A paper describes a structure:
The ribosome, a macromolecular complex assembly consisting of ribosomal RNA (rRNA) and ribosomal proteins (rProteins), translates genetic information efficiently and accurately into proteins in all living cells.
The heterogeneous three-dimensional refinement of the particles used for the three-dimensional reconstruction revealed a differential effect of the small ribosomal subunit on the dynamics of the rearrangement of H68. In fact, while for SA70S_30, the heterogeneous three-dimensional refinement results in two identical classes with H68 in the original position, two distinct classes can be described for SA50S_30. After 50 min incubation, both 50S and 70S show two classes with rearranged conformation of H68. These data suggest that the rearrangement happens faster when the small ribosomal subunit is missing.
Numbering used by the authors:
A (entry chain R): 1 to 113
B (entry chain P): 1 to 136
C (entry chain T): 2 to 48
D (entry chain K): 3 to 167
E (entry chain a): 3 to 95
F (entry chain b): 12 to 93
The structure:
RNA sequence: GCGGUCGCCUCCUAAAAGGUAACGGAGGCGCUCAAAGGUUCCCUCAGAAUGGUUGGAAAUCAUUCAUAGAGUGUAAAGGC
RNA sequence: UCUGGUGACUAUAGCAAGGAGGUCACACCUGUUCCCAUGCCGAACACAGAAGUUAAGGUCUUUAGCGACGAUGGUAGCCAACUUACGUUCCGCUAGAGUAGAACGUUGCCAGGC
């Protein structure tokens, strides 16, 4: 009955405080993930005028699946848009980013990096 | 002697005396207001030596409503000494008035009393006054 | 607080000078510092 | 049992007691904040620490008075342990109906609260009574204050058969 | 009340205080169809506002064109003189 | 003539010369001071940096630009243009 | 003459850049801290009443009104 | 062109009421079997799964009552200037705050299922 809290609120609110030092210049474009109720995302971004530089998606449906931490979570953890982009800065609003969204941070650590 | 209780600082600056009035240019608590026409410092002692007297004409009749309260407390030295070794202890309380301000307010009682009462009361204040009839 | 002194045995020179309370921790303390003529952070004995 | 007794009677009423739009505007039970107190600043408070190991699930935190007027204020004493029901213990020593093990002051009031935060005080030795008075027969203050799933007393009332008071 | 004003002039130097002893006041209508296109009124025909509206109602304007009911709303009373300065109207739409 | 009751006052400190030190629109050098103040009245913007909790200085050559940040907070910047 | 002051820090006077006097009006310092330091995470203020051995209107954790009116080791302003 | 995602605008962008729809997509929804972990309870922090639903949020459309932006007409103040002794007054420039009438239930940046 009493005030229940929304959580997209504080998710983007924290993205704010976290978006004060890290920002993709396309010379090192950050890739930055909207966790969802069932799925996960990612996208490379350049941050000079806010246009959308590069793009993939987990949910893009070359294959769908379940198990939000799947090898589908690590195929979104591999995919790229081939260019001259190198080992990006993993934007993380989600705790233990070194392991939580490591599903994304794992597979791409070799080719995009 | 309308004075306060709790004051942060006890030594202050003389208030500015130039220009017109700001607020309290009308009357509320009664039909009849006594306006002011020049500038001075009314000094709480006037007020209670021009309130008891107006009521001693009013013979505890109708009721009044004061529209001036002394805030800035003025200070003064005692016996004439040298110049300059500190500031004198606070010994008074002052209120500043400008032209165009209602100082007193009363209700109910006849206009003969109003005139023949505010003329009694103004004879103590160092400011020149003028009657006001709530002239909408 | 009282003044102390640290020095790396290998170099045998006391250059670093820190402070320490005589009640908070009266037990002789010792930390690793970068003493000269060694090019490595050796152990300093706060004598 | 009790956690399901937060279901065995209530899912159908708490799906009907209101006639809201969807199932989820029609509430559940509001969570609890199992808290204890003391009337001594030293030893009763330093030695009223387990009765939570008895009733609550919290080992024992050390919060003190905040508002703390003239002689309320003290520091760091374990007078109010934050054993609020989160989800696991959210079926705590509260919905135990051991408030009948007194047979006095069952129906205390005509109602409960104008502030939705309800307070239900086992004043005396009403609660934790299945344990014999070995060391629990001394000074002991309670603090069962938590809100319920109803804006005022009104519909809160004539379906409150859970704790029946 | 049939009271008529006219469109006075802006770009005013403050030399008007002295053309003010001879009666006038500013006045500016609010409302659509026109703008703050000010009108000038005189007093000793307002020595008889006593019977005009009271304070709440209608006045003619005859202000060239668009002569309709206009409401003088605000108050700009003046100290020390029993004079008046900038009383002003509005359109009813 | 009579030894007075003295003054329980008389103490103050040296002024620090705070404020702006380079004007908006003029050309600078890498490393020059732009503002000196307690706390961050004007935040550091583009190619400028804060020192030890003051002295907003420049990091590259160019021309300075004073600007608003959000709704009520300002900022300073330098652009490489020559 | 007697008395009191003499160095450093904050504010007002000081007149919207900086600077600016009087035996002008107010407060402070002669440190402290192995943590109250560096780094990575994680969290959130008051003035508000509920009726809860006990109640000291104030001994408690909640709940919601809570807009910085809170908290900063130390005075005051500028800040968060 | 609808929604989801990033980057501009002075809350004109709001809190206060509601209205109505779907789960393509945000949501309410199941527990500790696991990754992490509350000195405190997996509600925040995590996992596999979603049979069940649209209240709420979410989005538009309504309230100018709730608050900021607030165009003119004046007016205080002020820079020169000629007077007089100024708590002023005249003469020239720039003219505020507050008060209205208003605008007022955001302009877009660039992508994804269409």
């Amino acid at each position: 009955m009493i005030s229940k809290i929304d959580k997209n609120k504080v998710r983007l609110k924290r993205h704010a405080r976290v978006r004060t030092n890290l920002s993709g210049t396309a010379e090192k474009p950050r890739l930055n993930v909207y966790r969802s109720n069932k799925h996960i995302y990612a996208q490379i971004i350049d941050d000079n005028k806010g246009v959308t530089l590069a793009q993939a998606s987990s949910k893009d449906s070359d294959i769908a699946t379940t198990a939000t931490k799947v090898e589908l979570a690590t195929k979104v953890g591999e995919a790229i848009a081939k260019k001259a982009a190198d080992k990006g800065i993993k934007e993380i609003v989600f705790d233990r980013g070194g392991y939580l969204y490591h599903g994304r941070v794992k597979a791409l650590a070799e080719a995009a990096r | 002697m309308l004075l306060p209780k709790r004051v942060k600082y006890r030594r202050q600056h003389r208030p500015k005396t130039t220009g017109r009035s700001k607020g309290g240019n009308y009357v509320t608590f009664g039909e009849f207001g006594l306006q002011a026409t020049t500038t001075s410092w009314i000094t709480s002692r006037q007020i209670e030596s021009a309130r008891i007297a107006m009521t001693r004409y009013m013979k505890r009749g109708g009721k009044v409503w004061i529209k001036i309260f002394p805030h800035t407390p003025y200070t003064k030295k005692p016996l004439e000494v040298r110049m300059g070794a500190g500031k004198g202890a606070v010994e008074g309380w002052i209120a500043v008035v400008k032209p165009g301000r209602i100082l007193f307010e009363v209700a109910g009682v006849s206009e003969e009393v109003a005139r023949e009462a505010l003329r009694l009361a103004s004879h103590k204040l160092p400011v020149k006054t003028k009657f006001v009839k709530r002239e909408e | 607080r009282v003044n102390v002194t640290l020095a790396c045995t290998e170099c045998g020179d006391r250059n670093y000078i820190t402070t320490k309370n005589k009640r908070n921790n009266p037990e002789r303390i010792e930390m690793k510092k970068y003493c000269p003529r060694l090019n490595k952070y050796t152990l300093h004995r706060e004598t | 049992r009790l956690k399901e007794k937060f279901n065995t009677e209530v899912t159908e009423n708490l799906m009907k007691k209101f006639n809201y739009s969807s199932v989820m505007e029609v509430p559940k039970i509001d969570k609890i904040v199992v808290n204890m107190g003391v009337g001594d600043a030293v030893q009763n408070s330093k030695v009223l620490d387990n009765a939570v190991e008895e009733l609550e699930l919290i080992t024992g935190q050390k919060p003190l008075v905040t508002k703390a007027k003239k002689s309320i204020a003290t520091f760091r004493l374990r007078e109010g342990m934050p054993i609020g029901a989160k989800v696991t213990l959210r079926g705590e020593r509260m919905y135990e109906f051991l408030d009948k093990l007194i047979s006095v002051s069952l129906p205390r009031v005509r109602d409960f609260q104008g502030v939705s935060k309800k307070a239900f005080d086992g004043r005396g030795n009403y609660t934790l009574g299945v344990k014999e008075q070995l060391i629990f027969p001394e000074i002991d203050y309670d603090k069962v204050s938590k809100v319920r799933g109803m804006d005022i007393v009104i519909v809160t009332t004539a379906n409150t058969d859970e704790e029946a008071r | 009340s049939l009271k008529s004003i006219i469109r006075q002039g802006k770009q005013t130097r403050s030399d008007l205080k002295q053309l003010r002893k001879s009666g006038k006041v500013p006045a500016v209508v609010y409302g659509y169809g026109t703008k703050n296109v000010s009108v000038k009124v005189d007093e000793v025909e307002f020595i008889k506002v006593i019977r005009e509206v009271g304070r709440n109602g209608v006045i003619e304007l005859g202000v060239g064109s668009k002569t309709i009911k206009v409401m003088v709303a605000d108050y700009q009373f003046d100290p020390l003189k029993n004079q008046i300065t900038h009383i002003d109207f509005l359109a009813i739409n | 003539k009579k030894g007075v009751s003295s003054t329980k006052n008389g103490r103050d400190s040296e002024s620090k010369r705070l404020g702006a030190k380079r004007a908006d629109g003029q050309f600078v050098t890498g490393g020059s001071i732009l503002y000196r103040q307690r706390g961050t009245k004007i935040y550091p913007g583009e190619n400028v940096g804060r020192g030890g909790d003051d002295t907003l200085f420049a990091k590259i050559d160019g021309v300075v630009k004073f600007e608003r940040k959000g709704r009520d907070k300002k900022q300073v910047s330098v652009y490489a243009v020559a």
